[PDB]
Design a protein around this ligand. Structure first.
Ligand SMILES: Nc1ncnc2c1ncn2[C@@H]1O[C@H](COP(=O)(O)OP(=O)(O)OP(=O)(O)O)[C@@H](O)[C@H]1O
Ligand SMILES: [Mg+2]
Lengths: 384, 250
């Protein structure tokens, strides 16, 4: 376990041979070094003798406790599960480093003395807000954008994969990335390919669900959220639809906008706090970019501002080609009549038409998709 | 005092402004109108909104307004707003006629109105009009003409246009059924009865629920005739016959 971190010749050399031969002699020295201790000091088994001596110290009714202070000379005040706290002492098999206020520990039944500490059963919300797997396909699924994708790899992926380029430059990566445009323009869709691509611990949160009914529960949820993001790894925090904190008012919130405000203040701390931040990236996305506070949008808090335009028609045919790739297209159709049907159709619109047309074929048990499928299909999708 | 000022004139930080877009938002509701021509004559079809059983049903029209002796308009939007606009451009035609002793080119009339409508959008701190309208008329220069106003203050030359509640859905079939110069003023009639049949969510095509105006050129007349409700329903059932065989043969 972490015996020798050096690998640097990386060849067939007498260097890499003599490494092990040295460490060979040291590990044999450890073997026959400890071998004499039981040869001339049997006196025990030492594999379970001292171990069950510890387990003969500690009783089987192991009560579960929680720290609240520390006095260094192995005694402290520890809170009971009832609440009536004590002033017990602490053992020598307690390996006194994992002791923080509020931690779960192991106590005696009788004198309630601090026997051991307890590993904490994670947290329900960490898994809830924690994204497990890659959602879907890569960046090749998107099509048409091809410029800001270089922007997203630029601020996000390239800092991860090539931390040589910033160092030869004498520079750090940009901090904050924001995404804005018309709705249905693939804003979340790009983040799915990011969540495909990355190996970092990924988090995703809607801007709508920040708001609470309890006072300060929002900002508390923020503080523990950034706690979770920082405590894990090179992490990617995504926020969708952050305008919804400013647009809609809900009567579940006891406070009005002057609690929403305080929520945005605590978040505004967590972007640009004086504390050492660490390796957490921030991707934001919405459609109403003009509405929120520009104080969150200052450089220092967000560096990169990324608009998503409406698709041009030669990109539209590409998006049709993507959403018609694996499907049994009957050759009755022409996609170019389908392009100019709406002047300002989204990429959600194309897939809506395609999938709904597949629903129309599955009404008639068919396998291929004909022209009138699209004819009545856009009647269903667009006009209502 | 300036606290009470609403600034109905300035731009948005995205460059546009919101007030006339609220107006053109409102013009999508409360009315259904269309016009069509390809030949001698031009037709207007307007769907009547108030269909309560206790109406005296007078004044010869609802959204149809004879402007000159050879041109007329069908209106859409807020009626009370429109009434000032109607007689407003009406004596502008009359001051043209007084000025030159001649009827007016329909297009240059429309421009002159759209200046005035454009002015409130431009300054004055003034609530504009949520009113858009069509234009039928005849001249010596181009004969039968068709134009379309916008509450923004710009206009458009067309031949056949609906500004209904389902206006683009109508337009989708309008560019699915037409012919340039050949849709005579019965073929465009039966086409139109299909169009209002389509965007009419109320089916069965109540003849009293619609209004249709005609503008033909008779030699020194330019006959503008709103046809009575004795001949709507024969065109209605005339559509109903061909739709039954037309469906049935498929
Ligand atoms: N350029 C595109 N190519 C392929 N599919 C697209 C494109 N744009 C949008 N889509 C389809 O539209 C759907 C909606 O994507 P997404 O939700 O990312 O857009 P959005 O702008 O984030 O939507 P919203 O504004 O509702 O958050 C996606 O599942 C995607 O398949
Ligand atoms: Mg989305």
């Amino acid at each position: 376990a972490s015996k020798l971190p050096l690998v640097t010749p990386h060849t067939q050399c007498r260097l890499k041979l003599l490494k092990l031969e040295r460490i060979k002699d040291y590990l044999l020295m450890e073997e026959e070094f400890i071998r004499n201790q039981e040869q001339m000091k049997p006196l025990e088994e030492k594999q379970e003798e001292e171990r069950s001596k510890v387990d003969d110290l500690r009783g089987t009714p192991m009560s579960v406790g929680t720290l609240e202070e520390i006095i260094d000379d192995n005694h402290a005040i520890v809170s009971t599960s009832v609440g009536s706290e004590h002033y017990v002492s602490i053992l020598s098999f307690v390996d006194k480093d994992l002791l923080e206020p509020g931690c779960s520990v192991l106590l005696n039944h009788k004198v309630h003395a601090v026997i051991g500490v307890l590993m904490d059963d994670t947290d329900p919300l960490v898994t809830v807000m924690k994204v497990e797997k890659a959602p879907q396909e890569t960046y090749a699924d998107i099509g048409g954008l091809d410029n800001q994708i270089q922007e997203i790899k630029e601020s996000v992926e390239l800092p991860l994969t090539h931390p040589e380029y910033y160092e030869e430059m004498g520079i750090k990566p940009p901090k904050g990335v924001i995404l804005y445009g018309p709705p249905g323009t693939g804003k979340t869709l790009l983040a799915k390919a990011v969540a495909n691509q990355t190996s970092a611990t990924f988090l995703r949160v809607v801007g709508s669900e920040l708001i609470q009914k309890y006072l300060g529960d929002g900002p508390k949820l923020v503080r523990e959220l950034f706690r979770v993001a920082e405590e894990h790894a090179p992490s990617i925090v995504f926020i969708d639809e952050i305008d919804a904190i400013g647009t809609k008012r809900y009567d579940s919130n006891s406070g009005g906008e002057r609690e929403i405000q305080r929520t945005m203040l605590e978040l505004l701390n967590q972007l640009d706090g004086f504390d050492s931040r660490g390796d957490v990236k921030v991707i934001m996305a919405t459609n109403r970019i003009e509405t929120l506070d520009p104080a969150l949008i200052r450089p220092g808090r967000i560096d990169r501002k990324i608009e998503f335009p409406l698709p041009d028609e030669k990109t539209k045919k590409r998006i049709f080609q993507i959403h018609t790739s694996r499907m049994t297209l009957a050759d009755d159709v022409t996609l170019d009549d389908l392009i100019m049907a709406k002047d300002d159709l989204s990429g959600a619109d194309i897939k809506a038409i395609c999938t709904e047309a597949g629903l129309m074929a599955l009404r008639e048990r068919r396998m291929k998709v004909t022209n009138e499928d699209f004819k009545k299909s856009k009647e269903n999708v667009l006009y209502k | 005092s300036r606290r009470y000022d609403s600034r109905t004139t300035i731009f948005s930080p995205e460059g546009r402004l919101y007030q006339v877009e609220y107006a053109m938002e409102a013009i999508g509701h409360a009315g259904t109108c269309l016009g069509i021509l390809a030949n001698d004559g031009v037709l207007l079809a307007a769907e009547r909104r108030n269909i309560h059983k206790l109406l005296d049903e007078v004044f010869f029209s609802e959204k149809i307004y004879k402007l000159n002796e050879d041109m007329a308009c069908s209106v859409a939007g807020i009626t009370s707003d429109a009434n000032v606009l109607t007689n407003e451009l009406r004596l502008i035609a009359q001051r043209y006629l007084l000025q030159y002793q001649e009827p007016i080119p329909c297009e240059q009339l429309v421009t002159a109105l759209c200046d005035i409508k454009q002015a409130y959008t431009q300054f004055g701190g003034k609530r504009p009009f949520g009113v858009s309208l069509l234009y039928i008329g005849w001249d010596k220069h181009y004969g039968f003409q068709l134009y379309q106003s916008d509450p923004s203050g710009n206009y458009g030359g067309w031949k056949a246009t609906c500004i209904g509640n389902n206006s683009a859905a109508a337009v989708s079939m309008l560019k699915q059924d037409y012919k340039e110069g050949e849709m005579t003023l019965k073929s465009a009639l039966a086409l139109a009865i299909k169009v209002l049949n389509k965007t009419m969510d109320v089916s069965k095509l109540s003849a009293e629920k619609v209004e249709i105006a005609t503008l033909t050129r008779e030699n020194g007349k330019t006959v503008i005739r709103v046809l009575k409700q004795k001949e709507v329903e024969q065109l209605i059932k005339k559509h109903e016959e061909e739709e039954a065989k037309a469906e049935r043969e498929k």
